[PDB]
Amino acid sequence: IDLQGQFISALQSLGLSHDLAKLLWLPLPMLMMLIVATVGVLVAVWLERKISAAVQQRIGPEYIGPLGILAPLADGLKLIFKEDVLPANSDRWLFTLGPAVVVIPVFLSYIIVPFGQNLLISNLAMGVFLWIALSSIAPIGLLMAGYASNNKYSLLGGLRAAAQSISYEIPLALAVLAVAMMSNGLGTVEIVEQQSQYGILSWNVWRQPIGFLVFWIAALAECERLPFDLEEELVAGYQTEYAGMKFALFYLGAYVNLVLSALLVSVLYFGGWSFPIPLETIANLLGVSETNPFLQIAFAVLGITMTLIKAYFFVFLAILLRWTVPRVRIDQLLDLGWKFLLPVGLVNLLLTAGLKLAFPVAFGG
Amino acid sequence: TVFVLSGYEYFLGFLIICSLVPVLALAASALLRPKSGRMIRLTTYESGMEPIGGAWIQFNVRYYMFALVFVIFDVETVFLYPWAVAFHQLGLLAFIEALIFIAILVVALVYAWRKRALEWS
Amino acid sequence: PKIETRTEPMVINMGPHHPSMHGVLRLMVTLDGEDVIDCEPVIGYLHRGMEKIAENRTNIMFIPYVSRWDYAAGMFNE
Amino acid sequence: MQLTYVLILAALLFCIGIYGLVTSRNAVRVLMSIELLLNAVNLNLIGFANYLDGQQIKGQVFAVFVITVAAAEAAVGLAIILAIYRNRDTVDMEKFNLLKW
Amino acid sequence: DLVTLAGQLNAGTILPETILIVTLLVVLLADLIQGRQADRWTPYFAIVGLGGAIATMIPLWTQPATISFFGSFISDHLSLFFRGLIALSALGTILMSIRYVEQTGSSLGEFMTILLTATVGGMFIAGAQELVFIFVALETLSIASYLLTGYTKRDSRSNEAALKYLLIGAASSAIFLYGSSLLYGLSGGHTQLPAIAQALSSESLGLVVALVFVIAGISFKISAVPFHQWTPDVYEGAPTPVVAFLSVGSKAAGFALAIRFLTLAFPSVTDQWQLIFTVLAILSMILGNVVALAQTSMKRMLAYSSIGQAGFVMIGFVVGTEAGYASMLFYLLVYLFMNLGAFTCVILFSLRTGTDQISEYAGLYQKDPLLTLGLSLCLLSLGGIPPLAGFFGKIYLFWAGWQAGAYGLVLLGLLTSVISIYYYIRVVKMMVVKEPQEMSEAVRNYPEVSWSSFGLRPLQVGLVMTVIATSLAGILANPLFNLVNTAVWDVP
Amino acid sequence: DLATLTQTITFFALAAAVIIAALGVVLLDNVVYSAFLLGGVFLSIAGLYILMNADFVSAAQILIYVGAVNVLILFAIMLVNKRETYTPVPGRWLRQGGAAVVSLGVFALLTKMILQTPWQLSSVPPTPDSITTIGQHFFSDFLLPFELASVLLLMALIGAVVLARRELVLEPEPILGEEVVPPLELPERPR
Amino acid sequence: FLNQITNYAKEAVQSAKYIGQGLSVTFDHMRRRPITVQYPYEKLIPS
Ligand SMILES: CCCCCCCCCCCCCCCCCC(=O)OC[C@H](CO[C@@H]1O[C@H](CO[C@H]2O[C@H](CO)[C@H](O)[C@H](O)[C@H]2O)[C@H](O)[C@H](O)[C@H]1O)OC(=O)CCCCCCCCCCCCCCCCC
Ligand SMILES: CCCCCCCCCCCCCCCCCC(=O)OC[C@H](CO[C@@H]1O[C@H](CO[C@H]2O[C@H](CO)[C@H](O)[C@H](O)[C@H]2O)[C@H](O)[C@H](O)[C@H]1O)OC(=O)CCCCCCCCCCCCCCCCC
Ligand SMILES: CCCCCCCCCCCCCCCC(=O)OC[C@H](COP(=O)(O)OC[C@@H](O)CO)OC(=O)CCCCCCCCCCCCCCC
Ligand SMILES: CCCCCCCCCCCCCCCC(=O)OC[C@H](COP(=O)(O)OC[C@@H](O)CO)OC(=O)CCCCCCCCCCCCCCC
Ligand SMILES: CCCCCCCCCCCCCCCC(=O)OC[C@H](COP(=O)(O)OC[C@@H](O)CO)OC(=O)CCCCCCCCCCCCCCC
Ligand SMILES: CCCCCCCCCCCCCCCC(=O)OC[C@H](COP(=O)(O)OC[C@@H](O)CO)OC(=O)CCCCCCCCCCCCCCC
Ligand SMILES: CCCCCCCCCCCCCCCC(=O)OC[C@H](COP(=O)(O)OC[C@@H](O)CO)OC(=O)CCCCCCCCCCCCCCC
Ligand SMILES: CC1=C(/C=C/C(C)=C/C=C/C(C)=C/C=C/C=C(C)/C=C/C=C(C)/C=C/C2=C(C)CCCC2(C)C)C(C)(C)CCC1
Ligand SMILES: CC1=C(C/C=C(\C)CCC[C@H](C)CCC[C@H](C)CCCC(C)C)C(=O)c2ccccc2C1=O
């Protein structure tokens, strides 16, 4: 089936000019992905709060709804009603647009992640470039907000957080390179197709086990899960200067980055829209599956369900390992990063190239 | 010339939609303010007292050196992208020359690691 | 904003809030980078004048004061 | 969309970079206009590889090499600049009048 | 590996550059592992590697001229001669820098890494057929000369000159890169210069604009009259072995790039830039040999003498005969040894005394006769005394200029040489003529007439070898003219 | 008809943004404002590279000239920050007028060169990919600059590490001559 | 020099085993019921 082709045929049967009819079709999924992203953010805030309560043997937020699920919605509806306060400095537009410069590209990078063969936005050539080069912008907004903060401690904390953030970009690119060499492509569709050709025996987690751990450590260092940079040299790193609106924007941006990383790690290594049993055997066992959509709709729902359970598993593992491993210093974190993830990533790329040039049978060829 | 590619209207439309929403949320927060802005006594954030020390930062080199090694390895990663892209029918001499490139940059990393090029003591 | 980075030692004034578990103490830390050179402690935000309380007070009227001397155990002063 | 408007924009960016190389009221804006002067020739090479070149593209390769060269030149220039603040007290270019005839 | 891909790659005309790269890697590894206590075998190992790189060009000399890396590098006798010239410059720079760097205070291996990098860049730019390869090698030499200027570690003169040199070099590199992009856009899309020069016979104004925009960045490297505004400030504040390398190696690299690029790119518009080169030489020789009469600093005097003597080489490039470039190839070969001796004597006089003012030069006939003897025998060769080789170069230069039909250029060159001999003889007048109880201070207490401390013997024997070479090249130059003339007929 | 119309509209808007931001870099009397407008110049020229044909070159443009070069520029700006009063020089108006007429003459000469020299436009469709051919050209035509860029970046990193060291140690050299040389200085002493 | 590398590898595998034991006791802590009280639904008995 094709909903876009049927909508185009219905608008042609109504009578139009085939250009303005096709122009306005894109904003409805372009807003639907945004509203389900805010739905996932409101899911993840309640999930993190209740799982942090269940780890420390207590109950999360209650007496707000049925079980307190409206509490992220109540927080997001209350924090936009607070009085926007400003410090005694200049450049008010810079202080306003700093968090805007932070919030724009991480929200913009939603055109990369897929949910199936057709349930995605853009897969042109190089979606990993459009993730990395857009995620490497937020230090500029962080330094801009630190300069407009007008403080001696918050500016130093913003400098330390920017130096922590820019160091974990190079193994984050090398772990992408180690998979893009084997997949001979930069788009996520070919990467997930080379994993969905076979079942469990074609997963990239068993082919590149060191690169998955390097990418996971780099993601946990980039989304500020284990580095506590929010006791940061007087009280906090880049805080204690904004109002409820800018703090809410930073909180939702951090949760968007966490959700996007938890989706992208599974997509690049484990693989959403996949099954342990191949779909061709089930399609041959059931009947004829080439035009009948009654099984294809259920297969698309099952692929969305597999992507959602993988994202929920990675989110639960990240927020379980937040309070499991103890807090380490940012100097020790930068030292372990630059002394571990770069050399083992380089020799992992070298052994990946050697295994691809030695036996090009089970790899991408 | 003609502009034919895989598509770029989604990127521009999503940029327009994602750039229209933060200033709209800021305008809504300014509209639903309790009274107004323009606080009568504007004070910066100090923990418990008045500013008694000074507005100066000690001259350091650790941030600039980290960003220097970051840009030096980023322009290496940029050159390392298309070799890994075009490694499907190219051969083994390109792998040898990329191994020489990787070994030269590993020698550069060893030179940066041995001396005091990055040290947050 | 006026943040002029110079080549002078930075005086860090830790406020008397300490919002983790500590009370009132104004710590002035003088340093020149990633170390600590000088430290000045300033107190006087919790002094209640207990010695003036016991000037005109008997033994049966001094028990809650002497228990509120130290708020960790208290029974050692009693 | 024609090549002539892109060439006119590249020439105007080159003249803006020339003026910001001459006056600049600073020493970091000199390098910031040097990046504009090289981004003008990057626009020139990208437009030439878009319009004149066909299948075998090489102006994009030259633009990538020019970008890497300008990043290395920016690193060398900032390494030159950051020693002047350690040695001298001021940052103004007009105060450097020691090496006379 | 495959034999067909290795035969189609033709990586056999690259071996001394790979030997120098391996030598750079071994020097960097020895500096990283051992440290500062291994500063007694590393420059001798680099000298051995430079000799092994310059000795393996003899099987490369008797070889047919083939292209390599799919029409990217061209190997001829001219490129081998320029590579040997750059290697002989670098070995003398090492021999003059061994004591000077350790007397400055920095580590020697970190300087020798950038010196070998500049040597590899010069050896790569001695060929440089491809346009992007020309830009990469030129910016490699430019970044090398940037980083070799600020070596004094917060001494004010070098870091005050390095920013001006960075500004002027970045402006010239932007102008040359805009001209290179224009020259790429004028053709159909080709990058190889025989493929570019075939479709450029239309006589457009954009060809002239691109020629001026390329020759501006070229003449910045040659340092002719309209771009000589960096060198009198650069040559004083920079350290002396750095400027001793930059006065000959970068100049020969710019001359080789100018010759090869103009020959392989413009065999149609030669008369348009011949008049420009006559104007540049006429202004440059006059401005150098008139400005250099009034300067009181010795290093600035040699700096302006470099500009005054760089204009004589342009007279051989103005003409179109086959004997014109042979004059430049002989004059650069003489000028290498002349500038090497004139820099070694200044390095010795500045390391044994301190500052090197002109009026301090009195009282050298009694303290050290060998130093003033070498300085006199080198400055007389720089002046044009007929027992020495500089006169033998200038006679061939004026003969080629009068044979091709340039009378006024030879007349102005003779007039500027007659003017320039007055300040060329002034250092000898301060040295060997001044009587006792006339010299200035800090001359009467010379403690170190003997050299026995930390490798002063290679610095002495390099000056001895330079003096013997510039004394024997004047009366005995019969194979040198044949070796020059056998590498000039290949240029069309 | 509509797609070319919106492409020309976005091209004219990006060109106007280039002009106003390049004016705001060199005319505003603040360094951080010129740095942020230079970042806006980088984003606008990245969109202009996206518009015509460039995807990988535009991605490298975004990555380098946003995440590394502009961040290092902002680091050098925030490191060198001190309040000083710019003294009035005796002559600046004639220098600014000379720079203005040089820029105007260069612009007029380049405009005459563009309008005089014609160009040969091609009528062939471009390739749908732009990473495969350039990835093939790094080992067939342009082979030696691929390693000379690495040697150049090695030399630049070595020189920047040398120029960026703190040099906390202090050790005097043995005397060689009459005047003692200070550590990490020049033997050529001024008068 | 190799003994320091083996000691670093032993410290790394010991840190990995400590991280695994922390994950094990964290997964163990999810089995027990919460021991808190509700207010004003489960008020304490005054002695
Ligand atoms: C812990 C974290 C938790 C996370 C949160 C979990 C809780 C939330 C989970 C919710 C599920 C997540 C969101 C689902 C995945 C995103 C799917 C999506 O975005 O998916 C986007 C989809 C579009 O996707 C696919 O798009 C296709 C078009 O693709 C084309 O376009 C695509 C680009 O859009 C690609 O380029 C693709 O290659 C190209 O072919 C077709 O439209 C397919 O039908 C469609 O499935 O948007 C649409 O669904 C269309 C938009 C609605 C339009 C309404 C339909 C129009 C009305 C038609 C009525 C017809 C009436 C006449 C009837 C005739 C009567 C006789
Ligand atoms: C008071 C307020 C009221 C609000 C009113 C709003 C009502 C309307 C919104 C309700 C949405 C919920 C209803 C569920 C609709 C799900 C339809 C579906 O998935 O429709 C499926 C179709 C299938 O799409 C077609 O599917 C085809 C078959 O492919 C599928 O099969 C292939 C097999 O190899 C491949 O795997 C391929 O990737 C996979 O997509 C092709 O892909 C075509 O391109 C594409 O058109 O998707 C489509 O068109 C796109 C449909 C987008 C739906 C995404 C919503 C998320 C799904 C709900 C979450 C699952 C919940 C299920 C709960 C059940 C619990 C037991
Ligand atoms: C909720 C409502 C919100 C409002 C809705 C949003 C409306 C937004 C889009 C309008 C819909 C109609 C137009 C789309 C429909 C449309 O007509 O597009 C289609 C058009 C051409 O597409 P195709 O070539 O596929 O179409 C023709 C083919 O069918 C055959 O040739 O796409 C483009 O022109 C891409 C333009 C991208 C241009 C390059 C990107 C520029 C990015 C610049 C980045 C700048 C950064 C700046 C930083 C300072
Ligand atoms: C980290 C350390 C890096 C140090 C540099 C590494 C050197 C390793 C290889 C040596 C290069 C020379 C090989 C010639 C030595 C030699 O003559 O070998 C012989 C052969 C060339 O033979 P010809 O085909 O010229 O045959 C000559 C005969 O016909 C005459 O009998 O070379 C090869 O087989 C080429 C393949 C080597 C592998 C590819 C090397 C070329 C790429 C290397 C990078 C080149 C640019 C370097 C400068 C930037
Ligand atoms: C066309 C003209 C070309 C001419 C070039 C000249 C070529 C010959 C130059 C040789 C003179 C240099 C040695 C004299 C120096 C000399 O005689 O003095 C000995 C020299 C100085 O030692 P000291 O006396 O300082 O020793 C320490 C003292 O404190 C204890 O007495 O020590 C050496 O052994 C240095 C190591 C030389 C190592 C030589 C290289 C090792 C072999 C390398 C194999 C290389 C393969 C190629 C590279 C991959
Ligand atoms: C191998 C292929 C390349 C060869 C090219 C030749 C380069 C030039 C020669 C340098 C080799 C090393 C000499 C180092 C010299 C060396 O290391 O010291 C050898 C020795 C000085 O050291 P002693 O052994 O006296 O010192 C022992 C110490 O322990 C006392 O402190 O003899 C000297 O007096 C040399 C005097 C300079 C004499 C220079 C003469 C150069 C030859 C000129 C031939 C002229 C022919 C003229 C015809 C008219
Ligand atoms: C099914 C998928 C399961 C994937 C789970 C893996 C995600 C765990 C990543 C750890 C995040 C925290 C990193 C903090 C790590 C931390 O803070 O300590 C790191 C610690 C640093 O120790 P030091 O500070 O002593 O070391 C530096 C000093 O030695 C300076 O000389 O040692 C490491 O460098 C070794 C790292 C091994 C790390 C191993 C991690 C994986 C352990 C779990 C293995 C699971 C196997 C599962 C098989 C089913
Ligand atoms: C068909 C279907 C369905 C179903 C579903 C399902 C069946 C699901 C399930 C599944 C699941 C339910 C999932 C989840 C999971 C999660 C988890 C469970 C996680 C956690 C864990 C962790 C993270 C841990 C860790 C660790 C490690 C790694 C080491 C050792 C130790 C431990 C183990 C602790 C529904 C109804 C929806 C609808 C649609 C369709
Ligand atoms: C290192 C050292 C040596 C060893 C140095 C010796 C081997 C001389 C080295 C000279 C080199 C070999 C000269 C190289 C010759 C070149 C071929 C010349 C070509 C360049 C010219 C154009 C100048 C001594 O002989 C010595 C003697 C007395 C006291 C101290 C020392 C001392 O410290």
Author numbering:
A (entry chain A): 5 to 234, 238 to 372
B (entry chain C): 12 to 132
C (entry chain H): 2 to 79
D (entry chain E): 1 to 101
E (entry chain B): 2 to 493
F (entry chain G): 2 to 192
G (entry chain I): 3 to 49
Sentences from the paper on this structure:
Among them, cyclic electron transfer around photosystem I (PSI CET) is an important mechanism that balances the ATP/NADPH ratio required for the Calvin–Benson cycle and reduces the ROS production. The NDH-1 complex is a key component of this pathway in most photosynthetic organisms and its inactivation leads to growth defects and even cell death under environmental stresses. Previous studies strongly suggest that, together with Fd, the NDH-1M module constitutes a key portion of the PSI CET pathway—electrons donated by photoreduced Fd are transferred to PQ via the chain of three conserved [4Fe-4S] clusters, corresponding to previously identified N6a, N6b, and N2 clusters in respiratory complex I19 (Fd-N6a-N6b-N2-PQ).
We purified the endogenous NDH-1L from the thermophilic cyanobacterium Thermosynechococcus elongatus BP-1 using a native polyhistidine tag on subunit NdhF1. We determined the cryo-EM structure of the NDH-1L complex at 3.6-Å resolution, which indeed lacks the NdhV subunit. Hereafter, we will refer to this complex as NDH-1LΔV. Absorption spectrum of the excised yellow band from the gel showed the characteristic absorption peaks of β-carotene, further confirming the presence of β-carotene in the purified NDH-1LΔV complex from T. elongatus thylakoid membranes. Given that we purified the endogenous NDH-1LΔV complex from T. elongatus thylakoid membranes with a mild detergent (digitonin), the lipids we found in the NDH-1L structure are very likely physiologically relevant and reflect their actual binding positions in NDH-1L in vivo, suggesting that lipids in NDH-1L may play important roles as lipids found in other photosynthesis complexes of cyanobacteria. To further examine the function of NdhV, we used the M55 (the ΔndhB strain of Synechocystis 6803) mutant thylakoid membranes that exhibit a complete loss of the Fd-dependent PQ reduction activity due to the lack of functional NDH-1 complexes. This activity can be partially restored when supplemented with purified T. elongatus NDH-1LΔV and can be further alleviated by addition of purified T. elongatus NdhV.
